[PDB]
């Protein structure tokens, strides 16, 4: 038998109750929500995400999230959230709508989840099912390696796939992650990524870049560029799948042009 799934229908919203909220650091939270019973699982295929929706100051707001939990976790779903507070970043004085709304929730409050969503599903042992659009059949392709470029919150789609591969000892897919952030302080999920590197270095390659670097810095500084893609993703001759998730100017200016310069087919670079 298999556990009961929570996300039974992708057009249904499921209000889930907040049970724990961890202050990871000043602006990072881990929120745990209860599933309908302690024996349920979420029902989120690897590669897909959920949406949160709420009425936030009178207007509907919907945003995608990839949990840090998996379908191995019974009874709960965990989201790691960067809270974008007002009056912090000069280009974003209002801060972020859903992340500040999540920060305001009280234990016992509910929020609507929906899913699964997303055009990519990882089928295991290097095989990805990628739809060109939602109403269309997936292209299945099997790769030996996966390049991953994450910026900021775009790490959680990558971590979900990395963790699904590493937990299968007979999955020989090698993942190469290049993870960009504004500063060293702003990096999410660093201990979790470094645990995976400690345990799985043969199949997991980890590199960081930061827009501005600390005094003591072992990795890259600046935006993702051609050199970093040569040095930190599989070469195009190996025909890796390239996955990306990050802010639009990062994808548009830093990632796609440089993936193309290296020779990866741009048309095949998938953005979550
Ligand atoms: C597939 C997928 C999975 C995701 N998973 C996660 C996840 O697990 N965790 C997560 O936290 N997010 C995740 N995101 C991002 C998430 O969807 C939202 O974009 C994020 O929560 C911010 O939404 P918001 O409503 O708070 O901000 P919005 O109101 O939408 O603000 C717009 C943008 O303003 C910028 N911004 C606002 N304030 C600041 C500031 N203080 N500093 C810097 N920039 C700022 C941010 O770049 C923000 O995205 C994911 C996105 C995708 C596509």
Residue numbers in the entry: 1001 to 1272
Publication excerpt:
NADH-cytochrome b5 reductase (b5R; EC 1.6.2.2) is a flavoprotein containing one FAD molecule. A single-spanning transmembrane helix anchors the protein on the inner surface of the endoplasmic reticulum membrane. b5R mediates electron transfer from NADH to cytochrome b5 (b5). Flavin compounds such as flavin adenine dinucleotide (FAD), flavin mononucleotide (FMN) and riboflavin (vitamin B2) are utilized as cofactors of proteins for various oxidoreductive processes. The isoalloxazine ring is a redox center common to all of these compounds.
The valence electronic structures of FAD as well as the protein environment are experimentally determined and analyzed in order to investigate the properties of FAD in b5R. The most unexpected feature of FAD in b5R is the lone pair distributions around the N5 atom. On the other hand, we have to worry that the electronic distribution around N5 is an experimental and/or analytical artifact. However, we believe that the result is relevant for two reasons as follows. First, the radiation damages could be suppressed by the collection of data at low accumulated doses (1.8 × 105 Gy for the first data set and 0.9 × 105 Gy for the second data set) at 40 K. The values were smaller than the Henderson limit of 2.0 × 107 Gy applied to ordinal measurements around 100 K by more than two orders of magnitude. The second reason is that the valence electrons were clearly observed for both Data I and II, even in the residual maps of the ISAM refinements as well as the deformation maps of the MAM refinements. These multiple results enhance the validity of this study.
